[PDB]
Amino acid sequence: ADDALAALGAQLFVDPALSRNATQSCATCHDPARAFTDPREGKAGLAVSVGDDGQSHGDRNAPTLGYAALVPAFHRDANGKYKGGQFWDGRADDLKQQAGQPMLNPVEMAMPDRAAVAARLRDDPAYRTGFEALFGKGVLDDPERAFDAAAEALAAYQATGEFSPFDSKYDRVMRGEEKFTPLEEFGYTVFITWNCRLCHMQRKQGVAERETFTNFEYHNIGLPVNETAREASGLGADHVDHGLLARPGIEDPAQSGRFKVPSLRNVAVTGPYMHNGVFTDLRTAILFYNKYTSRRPEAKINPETGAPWGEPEVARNLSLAELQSGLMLDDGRVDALVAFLETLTDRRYEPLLE
Amino acid sequence: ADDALAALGAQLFVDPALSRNATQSCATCHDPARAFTDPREGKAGLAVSVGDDGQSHGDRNAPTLGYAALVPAFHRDANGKYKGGQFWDGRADDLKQQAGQPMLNPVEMAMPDRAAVAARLRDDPAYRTGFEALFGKGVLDDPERAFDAAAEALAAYQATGEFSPFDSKYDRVMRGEEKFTPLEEFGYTVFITWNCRLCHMQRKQGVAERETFTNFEYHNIGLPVNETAREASGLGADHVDHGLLARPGIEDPAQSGRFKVPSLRNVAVTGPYMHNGVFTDLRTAILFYNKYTSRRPEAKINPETGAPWGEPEVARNLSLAELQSGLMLDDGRVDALVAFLETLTDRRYEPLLEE
Amino acid sequence: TDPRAKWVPQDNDIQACDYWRHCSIDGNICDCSGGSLTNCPPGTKLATASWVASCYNPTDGQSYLIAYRDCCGYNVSGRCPCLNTEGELPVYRPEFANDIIWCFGAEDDAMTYHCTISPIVGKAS
Amino acid sequence: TDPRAKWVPQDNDIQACDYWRHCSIDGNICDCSGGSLTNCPPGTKLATASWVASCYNPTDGQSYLIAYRDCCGYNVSGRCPCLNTEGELPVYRPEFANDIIWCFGAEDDAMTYHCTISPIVGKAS
Amino acid sequence: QETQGQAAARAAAADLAAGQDDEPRILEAPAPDARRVYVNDPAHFAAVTQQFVIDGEAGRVIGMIDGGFLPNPVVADDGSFIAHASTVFSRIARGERTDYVEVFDPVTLLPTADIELPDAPRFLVGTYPWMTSLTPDGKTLLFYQFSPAPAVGVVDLEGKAFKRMLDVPDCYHIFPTAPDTFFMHCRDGSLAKVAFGTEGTPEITHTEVFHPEDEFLINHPAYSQKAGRLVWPTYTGKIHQIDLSSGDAKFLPAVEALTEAERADGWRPGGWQQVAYHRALDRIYLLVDQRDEWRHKTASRFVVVLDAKTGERLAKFEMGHEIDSINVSQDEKPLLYALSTGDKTLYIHDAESGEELRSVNQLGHGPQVITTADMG
Amino acid sequence: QETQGQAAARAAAADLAAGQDDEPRILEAPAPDARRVYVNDPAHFAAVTQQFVIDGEAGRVIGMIDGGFLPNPVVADDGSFIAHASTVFSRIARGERTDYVEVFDPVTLLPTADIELPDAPRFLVGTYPWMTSLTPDGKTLLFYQFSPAPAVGVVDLEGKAFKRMLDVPDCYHIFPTAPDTFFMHCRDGSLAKVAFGTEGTPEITHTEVFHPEDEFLINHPAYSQKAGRLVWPTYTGKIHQIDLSSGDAKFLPAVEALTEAERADGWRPGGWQQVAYHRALDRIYLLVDQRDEWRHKTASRFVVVLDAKTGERLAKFEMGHEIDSINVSQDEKPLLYALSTGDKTLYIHDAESGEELRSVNQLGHGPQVITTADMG
Numbered sequence A: 001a002d003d004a005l006a007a008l009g010a011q012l013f014v015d016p017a018l019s020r021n022a023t024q025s026c027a028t029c030h031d032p033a034r035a036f037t038d039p040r041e042g043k044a045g046l047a048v049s050v051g052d053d054g055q056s057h058g059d060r061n062a063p064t065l066g067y068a069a070l071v072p073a074f075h076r077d078a079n080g081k082y083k084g085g086q087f088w089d090g091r092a093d094d095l096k097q098q099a100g101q102p103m104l105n106p107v108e109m110a111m112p113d114r115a116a117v118a119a120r121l122r123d124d125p126a127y128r129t130g131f132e133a134l135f136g137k138g139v140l141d142d143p144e145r146a147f148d149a150a151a152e153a154l155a156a157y158q159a160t161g162e163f164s165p166f167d168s169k170y171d172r173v174m175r176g177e178e179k180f181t182p183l184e185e186f187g188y189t190v191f192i193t194w195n196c197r198l199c200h201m202q203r204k205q206g207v208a209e210r211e212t213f214t215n216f217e218y219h220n221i222g223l224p225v226n227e228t229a230r231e232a233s234g235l236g237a238d239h240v241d242h243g244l245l246a247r248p249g250i251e252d253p254a255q256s257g258r259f260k261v262p263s264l265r266n267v268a269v270t271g272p273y274m275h276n277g278v279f280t281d282l283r284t285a286i287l288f289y290n291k292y293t294s295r296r297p298e299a300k301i302n303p304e305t306g307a308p309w310g311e312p313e314v315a316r317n318l319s320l321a322e323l324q325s326g327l328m329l330d331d332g333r334v335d336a337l338v339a340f341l342e343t344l345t346d347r348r349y350e351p352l353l354e
Numbered sequence B: 001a002d003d004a005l006a007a008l009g010a011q012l013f014v015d016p017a018l019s020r021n022a023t024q025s026c027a028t029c030h031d032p033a034r035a036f037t038d039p040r041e042g043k044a045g046l047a048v049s050v051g052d053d054g055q056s057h058g059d060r061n062a063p064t065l066g067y068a069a070l071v072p073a074f075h076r077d078a079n080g081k082y083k084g085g086q087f088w089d090g091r092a093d094d095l096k097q098q099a100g101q102p103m104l105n106p107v108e109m110a111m112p113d114r115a116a117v118a119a120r121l122r123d124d125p126a127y128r129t130g131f132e133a134l135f136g137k138g139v140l141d142d143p144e145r146a147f148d149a150a151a152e153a154l155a156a157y158q159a160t161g162e163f164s165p166f167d168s169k170y171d172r173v174m175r176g177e178e179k180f181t182p183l184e185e186f187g188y189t190v191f192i193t194w195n196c197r198l199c200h201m202q203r204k205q206g207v208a209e210r211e212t213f214t215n216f217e218y219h220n221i222g223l224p225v226n227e228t229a230r231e232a233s234g235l236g237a238d239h240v241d242h243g244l245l246a247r248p249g250i251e252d253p254a255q256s257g258r259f260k261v262p263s264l265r266n267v268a269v270t271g272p273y274m275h276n277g278v279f280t281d282l283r284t285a286i287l288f289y290n291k292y293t294s295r296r297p298e299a300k301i302n303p304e305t306g307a308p309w310g311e312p313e314v315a316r317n318l319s320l321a322e323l324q325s326g327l328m329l330d331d332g333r334v335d336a337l338v339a340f341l342e343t344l345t346d347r348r349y350e351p352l353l354e355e
Numbered sequence C, D: 001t002d003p004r005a006k007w008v009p010q011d012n013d014i015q016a017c018d019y020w021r022h023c024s025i026d027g028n029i030c031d032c033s034g035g036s037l038t039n040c041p042p043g044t045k046l047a048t049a050s051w052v053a054s055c056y057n058p059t060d061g062q063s064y065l066i067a068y069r070d071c072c073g074y075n076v077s078g079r080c081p082c083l084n085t086e087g088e089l090p091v092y093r094p095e096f097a098n099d100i101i102w103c104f105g106a107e108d109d110a111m112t113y114h115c116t117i118s119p120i121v122g123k124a125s
Numbered sequence E, F: 001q002e003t004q005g006q007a008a009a010r011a012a013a014a015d016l017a018a019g020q021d022d023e024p025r026i027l028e029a030p031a032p033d034a035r036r037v038y039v040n041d042p043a044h045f046a047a048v049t050q051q052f053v054i055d056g057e058a059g060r061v062i063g064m065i066d067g068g069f070l071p072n073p074v075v076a077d078d079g080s081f082i083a084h085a086s087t088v089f090s091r092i093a094r095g096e097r098t099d100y101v102e103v104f105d106p107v108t109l110l111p112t113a114d115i116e117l118p119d120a121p122r123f124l125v126g127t128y129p130w131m132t133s134l135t136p137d138g139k140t141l142l143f144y145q146f147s148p149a150p151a152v153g154v155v156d157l158e159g160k161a162f163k164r165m166l167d168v169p170d171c172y173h174i175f176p177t178a179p180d181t182f183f184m185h186c187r188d189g190s191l192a193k194v195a196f197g198t199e200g201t202p203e204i205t206h207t208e209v210f211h212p213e214d215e216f217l218i219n220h221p222a223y224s225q226k227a228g229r230l231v232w233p234t235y236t237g238k239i240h241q242i243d244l245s246s247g248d249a250k251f252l253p254a255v256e257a258l259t260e261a262e263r264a265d266g267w268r269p270g271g272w273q274q275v276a277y278h279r280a281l282d283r284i285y286l287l288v289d290q291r292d293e294w295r296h297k298t299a300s301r302f303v304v305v306l307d308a309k310t311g312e313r314l315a316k317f318e319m320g321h322e323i324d325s326i327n328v329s330q331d332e333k334p335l336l337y338a339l340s341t342g343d344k345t346l347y348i349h350d351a352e353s354g355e356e357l358r359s360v361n362q363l364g365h366g367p368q369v370i371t372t373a374d375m376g
């Protein structure tokens, strides 16, 4: 039944009937063959995703769905730091509150309202059988019950072993099953002794039972606008993506420009990087951090463009304490970090590494 | 002989025939009744002395002869510190080399030359006897032998226990014969733990046999000109008393404004003080030193005038190392130091201590 | 007390040099200066930088990654001094060197060394 | 060796705390840092100010005023420490009090304490 | 009988076994209380020094404050702050000198003021607690200057600025009584009352002389500001008591810490902080031992306790160690603090039985000053 | 048999009794010679530190130098000066940081240059002698920096000016060969030659890797600049020798300080300055003792001596104490210095027989480093 529920969500996840013109499904943008992300090329590369209308582009990179089941529900913890939720800006409380939003989003799946979704579900004999067997008879005749029920099944699907296998190289090495190379182990060592582990580790101290390389916090690391992505999103050159402050109910101006710490699981295979796909190479993502630490002129230059990285989209709320560590990553250290981050690739996605 | 020589000297010392108009002897300016100093009032009080011509004044205070026989002859020691000699600027090498100079100096005794000194000695039958028994016959017929001989005898006489009796309270205390009052004792303790011991003690460390409260060195402590005195001397407003540098032979301009540390013995009864007699009161001479240490507005002020100490006559080569002690003497300690310095009064002049 | 003998860890006293988490500590244990096993004493500043070591815990027979971090901006505590070197490498392998003052990234650019803490950050491997 | 016992002077070793001139010293014996019994070590500055004691010399049975003086401008030597108090008085009688750093009149206004010398200035009374 | 190291381990293990997380952070010291005790380490005249903030009840270092060359500590009685006057040079022990006052928060230990003292005026001396002093309203710090002459500095803590120097007679120590009044002990053997304001010559009145020239009063008298009780031992263990609580100096009758027999056999006070006074119980505590007469800075092994209204001996404790300084917590059932320079160790005793309860060791190179606050 | 303190005692007695005067003054140190030896005290990471200047022959402290947080001492080979790079802060251990180089006259101990280093560049680590180094003309001081990246600082002593930072690869230590050239030790296993001008990017050229990743070279090699001989032991006792006298690195036969049978009985170098090098005798000295593999920073009680050319053992000394640091005097009949951190004592030994001749103790709080000057 928890099994049935998830099995029902597996049908919906790949069903283009959930979009307005039936040209797309969740799996369109979160492709199981590419670690549940978008392999498609739009006007701003793979930085942003094209919606159901074949024209509209969003303003943010589509993250993996892998391991998002482990993310706790949205909440401010006792040190006053907001934690968890879903979307890069946390504006959904959890996987259930999230699942309806792509459906109704005009630049994504673009259904006109809950009733329309219910009409699409009611038109399929397997959904009538599957839904009423779990949520009771007439569920699909009520827009709210139906839509709510479709969210429930999608979330349950996402919380199964297929989305979170824990069978990467890093996992087998922590189970004693094998050994890092020299280069890989150097990388881990660099990861847990340099500032990364202040953000991309579940716990501050102690061992995590199910590590996802994210403490679920929100941080502004001072990324620039993605010029082209922003041009394609059509949101206007006067727009500012305020991150977590944009969540309704958040009024603290200190939250402007802050975005949830992504999990580095499968990171090698989910580029381009960051909330606005600004960087295509994993090497570049890592080297961006050097700009707060390094004195060499080359650290002021984005190696993918040849130019200065660019000013922060939101110049306030930088996490300078964590970012100003006072130690630069040489290339030998960047190489190792890449190598180790590659070991967070799930088994099934190791073929992609090349 | 060592006896007779000094007995002769004792005659010449009080003999005014050695002055041009025979009004004056050593003992006029170096009065035994006032610790071998000048009690007479001239145009500048007791700061400087009047010569034999009734008129001319010197530019410098007349010092005590008491304990002058303990001063080594002029020399430079291994530290490059010139030491000793006679006069405030050390221009005489020792007591004998000195003894002549007053007799021939025109502002003082003012004889025209050695021959006229010989002409005066020669006129005394008691001089022909003494001189010839000591220095052999014909001494008084040769001007250069007679003058030299006169010096010899004046120097011998100054080296007697009459001039250095070591019978001050301080001595008696030191020999376990009496004790200091608490204030004298507190004054002594202050003297030996403050900067004074760095110049008013015979030695750098250890114990002297015969202490005279002076290390016989040369130092500029930054004294102003005494104007009334300098006017009386008639040397001119543009004159600068270069202290030691003015000794013939010294050319080091680092010796400009440096004078000989005077022995502090009998200091209580020989004011006014310093080379130009610029301070009337012992207390003022001690307080002068606070100028290098204190911050109080009163420490820039000479309590005798109610006006600033003054500009130094020679504003360079000041002994700032010793003078800037970082410690101001409060009134208690100035009282204490006055007290202690009175204990350096020879017994015969203790009566003088009242006035 | 035999300094040249194998180090032998214990898990009953954090203020002793042979407490299991101090296997590569170099300086002073913060617990003895107002801090705690994994907190900094008041007034001081916590580094972000660390050196690391694999430390065998005799209680549960596992090995843990101790990321040693320095508390900085004060003179050295002088209390419960300690020098251990379990798996310690030369300065040219800095993530495992402990002669280095790992005060980097501390508030106010505090760089003087007061004492160290000993927080677990991983399982060894 | 019994700290509360009557101090007993010797005149055969200047780097010991029972040397006769050290009767009211408080700090460090300057001979032990490149100075000498009565000279400051290189680099330091000699105070003009002092404090005195009357020390008995067991070589000639006499007592001597020792006007102690500091060598200043350097952190304390740490070698040959000594604290003695024969005739030593509280602060309100400063000439005899040895708690005080007697660095006044040193060149360059040095006021830090390094070691102390023990020259004679005169006999006792 | 389990130590603090042992408890912390046991808890660490349970956090580990339970998987209890926590964020490594900057602790706060517990809130100032009666059983807080500060120890200062002049470090045998070292150019940089340390203060140790201790919970007397647990026997635990709860904090430290760094200082310069011979700093003078104070501790506000209400617990609202702590502060010191200190000194530093541009190159360790050499070059330019800066004297300053720092005011710290008592639980963060963070500086809340840094007030520069012009012209390097502090008295550099083996630390005497009453050579720097707070006024009873906690608004003003007063410090002694020796050089170039006796004078008192006035620092406005509330406005964080230096006000003025005060010219004083030949006097020493500073015992505040009011926001604008303190007392000093002068060389003639009187006390002097100094009444001051922001500018003008202060009104300075001498008491009558209360001791002869050849009786010696120690450099470490106890003064309870909240009782106005000045308690001043001599080299022999005769104890002067002055009552200032009226705002003028009332001389109480003297008492003898030691019997005639004990005096005859060589018993004398000795050490550094040789005396303590508990306000609420009206008791005096005195470090004493058998010693030659010019061994008055040596350590002692005994404490005598006496009633301060009568002089009657209450008790003579054997401390078990070499002790240089003492003081008491000012609460009920107070602790008696016993600091050993030699052992660099604070032994903590029950003041009623004199039984050693616990100890704190490794307190620097030469700890010497114990400070408490009277919070009652 | 008569101690220095004793001799001094008789001299003073004899002056006193002969009435010899003498001015209390500032002494000068005796002139720099072969037997002069400098001992540095990092003081277990204390914020101020001391250097001790010692005559090796007499066994006497002849002077001292104060220093900041973890200073690096250098000594000029020709005896013309000593110097260090040091670090201070506006409030002891807190506030604004100043890094700086000070150069001193070696007989007056007075500073002759104070040269500030901009942007607080110094590497703060347990003192390694070759993290700060003089060029063989003595006109330039080169210091290492770790943060934010390996770099090298060039200070001009002659003009008394910091000039610039050299960017370098991931390399450690500074071994100068010429007025404009030095070597480092890089992570991969090479040495890097860095040739630099008064401006421009330096020319950097790697050698081949001369050791494996699993072979650990210590933080305290011996380098004779006048020989151009680098002498670098590994944790197990094997010894690399690099010849740089040509101005390029020629790698001599590696040698084995221990024999395979000793190594299997757990003989291993251990301590701080574990190795010394005597130039004339072409001789290597090494601190060894029986220990587990990860007690490499613990004190040792033996020194082996070997020929550099052939690798044959010449002697094995029992030092008799816990020794942490060794070095030698570079004259003929050299002394062997053995510094015990725990004991705070320099032990001075004959470097032929390894007999103890004399010692100097109370050497600060935790002394660690020995520096001599090769004046031959």
Ligand code: HEC
Residues within 6 Å of the ligand: B012, B013, B024, B025, B026, B027, B028, B029, B030, B049, B050, B051, B052, B058, B060, B061, B062, B063, B064, B065, B068, B085, B086, B087, B088, B089, B095, B098, B099, B102, B103, B107, B108, B109, B154, B260
């Ligand atoms: C006549 C026989 C004598 C003798 C033996 C001395 N004096 Fe005088 N004297 C006078 C003044 C003003 C000074 C200081 C002058 C200066 O520094 O240039 C002196 C100095 C001396 C000294 C030197 C003392 C010293 O301690 O440095 C000696 C040994 C000395 N005198 C002996 C004043 C006068 C006179 C003023 C009218 C007369 C006459 C004399 N002196 C005569 C003699």
Ligand code: HEC
Residues within 6 Å of the ligand: A012, A013, A024, A025, A026, A027, A028, A029, A030, A049, A050, A051, A052, A058, A060, A061, A062, A063, A064, A065, A068, A085, A086, A087, A088, A089, A095, A098, A099, A102, A103, A107, A108, A109, A154
């Ligand atoms: C055409 C694009 C598109 C479609 C269709 C789409 N998504 Fe997304 N998805 C995104 C983008 C872009 C983001 C990041 C958006 C943001 O944060 O504003 C996102 C975010 C999410 C997140 C938040 C993950 C995180 O780490 O914050 C979840 C969960 C998710 N999608 C699940 C789904 C499900 C379930 C469906 C359909 C049943 C769906 N998505 C349909 C593009 C799409």
Ligand code: HEC
Residues within 6 Å of the ligand: A191, A194, A195, A196, A197, A198, A199, A200, A218, A219, A220, A221, A223, A259, A260, A261, A262, A263, A264, A267, A270, A272, A273, A274, A275, A276, A282, A285, A286, A289, A319, A322, A323, A337
């Ligand atoms: C104090 C916070 C913080 C620190 C320190 C930090 N990160 Fe991140 N990191 C983030 C946040 C937040 C994001 C998402 C930011 C955004 O896109 O707006 C991010 C994104 C990334 C990404 C891109 C992942 C993706 O799917 O797009 C990589 C790779 C990454 N970090 C690696 C590192 C490494 C390697 C270090 C240090 C060695 C590091 N980070 C230090 C907060 C941090």
Ligand code: HEC
Residues within 6 Å of the ligand: B191, B194, B195, B196, B197, B198, B199, B200, B218, B219, B220, B221, B223, B259, B260, B261, B262, B263, B264, B267, B270, B272, B273, B274, B275, B276, B282, B285, B286, B289, B319, B322, B323, B337
């Ligand atoms: C470093 C030198 C130096 C120091 C220090 C010093 N003095 Fe003098 N003192 C002198 C010299 C030189 C004279 C003569 C000055 C002159 O006439 O120009 C002098 C003159 C005097 C006189 C006048 C004596 C006379 O016969 O005219 C007295 C009195 C005196 N000093 C007392 C003291 C006392 C008291 C102290 C310190 C407590 C002191 N001195 C410190 C060098 C010193």
Ligand SMILES: [Ca+2]
Residues within 6 Å of the ligand: A037, A061, A062, A063, A270, A271, A272, A273, A274
């Ligand atoms: Ca991506």
Ligand SMILES: [Ca+2]
Residues within 6 Å of the ligand: B037, B061, B062, B063, B270, B271, B272, B273, B274, B277
């Ligand atoms: Ca006179």
